[PDB]
Scaffold this active site. Structure first.
Site: not given
Ligand SMILES: CN(C)CCCCNC(=O)C[C@H](Cc1ccc(F)cc1)NC(=O)[C@@H](Cc1ccc(Cl)cc1Cl)NC(=O)[C@H](Cl)Cc1ccccc1C#N
Ligand SMILES: CN(C)CCCCNC(=O)C[C@H](Cc1ccc(F)cc1)NC(=O)[C@@H](Cc1ccc(Cl)cc1Cl)NC(=O)[C@H](Cl)Cc1ccccc1C#N
Ligand SMILES: [Cl-]
Ligand SMILES: [Cl-]
Ligand code: NA
Ligand code: NA
Ligand code: NA
Lengths: 305, 305
Positions: B41, B143, B145
């Protein structure tokens, strides 16, 4: 979201751990540039450890008595000396993985990360506070001596702790990297007792603030008390007294949540007097006192939920 | 002595964290040999994230849409592809710090270390269990991820988790390094609910054993119950059922302490029915279920106190 006991990433310190062997004794050392730092009691045999004169024992040694291993590669010692309770071994190779670093001594109530090591090899990492009685509640087995505690501040490693021994109560004692013990302890195998410990009040308040930041609110109330009135309930429950300078560092947390410090103290007072009535805060069923105001800010969001 | 939440040393994983940027989205990636792994993503804008077709969005990209940074040094992308929910970016440089590694998928109840990262830069390390509902109770801000979870087994890193998102309840969901989600979750910005969680019984028993190994004994008793009788009190308190294979891995802990598994189950039964009556175990006021039998053995002494 979420709140965890969080250590600093340990890689910069892992590149510095070596094994120091002197005779049949072996522990861990810290290799920075061309110096290895380790606990001086590596020079003691089993009998020496009972009542050692370290100046005597060191004068009877030479560079060849000391085996330093960084992995398989052996470092040859070209000098030795003593700085209080740490031994310093000059080696012929500067550690190329040496990070930017400082030796700092911390205060009771401050936290740091511990890289537990065995035979020069890192095995685990965890967070610790220096207790008000200058012990730490670590996790150390035999052979962990020489493991260091540290904070990281923009790729600069501040080394604050070297591990020396476990006390009878199972808590742990050591020195700063200048070899000065934290607390009234000495490096010899005699039964030594810490003073009575107390709870770190400013840290508990910081952790209540972390709770609010994360959405745990059930413990709050509308009440407020005064600084001096709180300090009386503190002494009753064996908590540190709260200073106006402690309130000030709690300032940023107070502002971000909208809950004044003395407001939060009232909730703490009530938690002390009534317990938790079965509920939990940040996944804990007791009041946690090993997160500093700085630890909360760095881990928690910049915006309250 | 002592018992702490202990993470694996993170250095071998720190050498692999990079920043991946695609448009205005930025998260962390894992660089092993000449491939960077990150959540797919990263290719979504704010509007794409609501109902994305990732095959469409990726076909509309080329190698130049992807900025990979390892510190300051930029890696040039020479290929991309999708493996389920992870994106794979082939780069022109093999990571020279690539450790020995494996991609493994863990089971509910197993633990791992998490290296939380922001903008490709490691900021903290902690321990986590995979919950029985396939979420983890992590500590992650925006952030994070692309942060990975891992175990270390003799300088081999077994990567088991890549972080993708936080659910409405504040718990965290992600994939294995093949991009297959843990649990019934999908990588799109819709409200998703985990199933109801349960307590990991075998882990609580392991942690009671760690207590005995460390000298905490107040909760023990002379009673014993049978496997099937315990499993009834388990279901009442929302605990996992105990299997004869769980007893067997608890075997080494049983032998080292001299306390049979079903003996310890009786003490657990009593702790569930009566609570702790104000006392604590290993510094905790609730029953901890995120230490596995393996975690206990590796941290605790080989000899009971
Ligand atoms: C109430 N219960 C639940 C708590 C149970 C806790 C039991 N706790 C112990 O049995 C540790 C024991 C306590 C002790 C200390 C001095 C003494 F007289 C007699 C006993 N401590 C050592 O035996 C020191 C002696 C020593 C050696 C050298 C020096 Cl300079 C100073 C001292 Cl005190 N050894 C280490 O610390 C070497 C490292 C080590 C070994 C074994 C286990 C852990 C560690 C660690 N880390
Ligand atoms: C009861 N209280 C005490 C608990 C309080 C907890 C509140 N919890 C949140 O507010 C997180 C919020 C919950 C949510 C999810 C979907 C949705 F419709 C609406 C809301 N989640 C996101 O907004 C996702 C949306 C999203 C984006 C991309 C994809 Cl693929 C999937 C999803 Cl679900 N963003 C990230 O996770 C990006 C990373 C991130 C951002 C912000 C904060 C943490 C993290 C992390 N780590
Ligand atoms: Cl020297
Ligand atoms: Cl590829
Ligand atoms: Na930790
Ligand atoms: Na209040
Ligand atoms: Na029993």
């Amino acid at each position: 979201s979420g709140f965890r006991k969080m250590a600093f990433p340990s890689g910069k310190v892992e590149g510095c751990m070596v094994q120091v062997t002197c005779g049949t004794t072996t522990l861990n050392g810290l290799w920075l540039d061309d110096v290895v730092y380790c606990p001086r009691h590596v020079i003691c045999t089993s009998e020496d450890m009972l009542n050692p004169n370290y100046e005597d024992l060191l004068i009877r040694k030479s560079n060849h008595n000391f085996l330093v291993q960084a992995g398989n590669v052996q470092l040859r010692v070209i000098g030795h000396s003593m700085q209080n309770c740490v031994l310093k071994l000059k080696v012929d190779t500067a550690n190329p993985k040496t990070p930017k670093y400082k030796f700092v001594r911390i205060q009771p109530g401050q936290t740091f990360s511990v890289l537990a090591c065995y035979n020069g090899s890192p095995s685990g990492v965890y967070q610790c506070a220096m207790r008000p009685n200058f012990t730490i509640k670590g996790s150390f087995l035999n052979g962990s001596c020489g493991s260091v505690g540290f904070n990281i501040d923009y790729d600069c490693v501040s080394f604050c702790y070297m591990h020396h021994m476990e006390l009878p109560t199972g808590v742990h004692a050591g020195t700063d990297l200048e070899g000065n013990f934290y607390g009234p302890f000495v490096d010899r195998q005699t039964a030594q007792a810490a003073g009575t410990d107390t709870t770190i009040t400013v840290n508990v308040l910081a952790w209540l603030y972390a709770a609010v930041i994360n959405g745990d609110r059930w413990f709050l109330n509308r009440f407020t008390t005064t600084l001096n009135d709180f300090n009386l309930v503190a002494m009753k429950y064996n908590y540190e007294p709260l200073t106006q300078d402690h309130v000030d560092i709690l300032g940023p947390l107070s502002a971000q949540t909208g809950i004044a410090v003395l407001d939060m103290c009232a909730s703490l007072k009530e938690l002390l007097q009534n317990g938790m009535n079965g509920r939990t805060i940040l996944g804990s069923a007791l009041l946690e006192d090993e997160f500093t105001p700085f630890d909360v800010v760095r881990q928690c969001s910049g915006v309250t939920f």
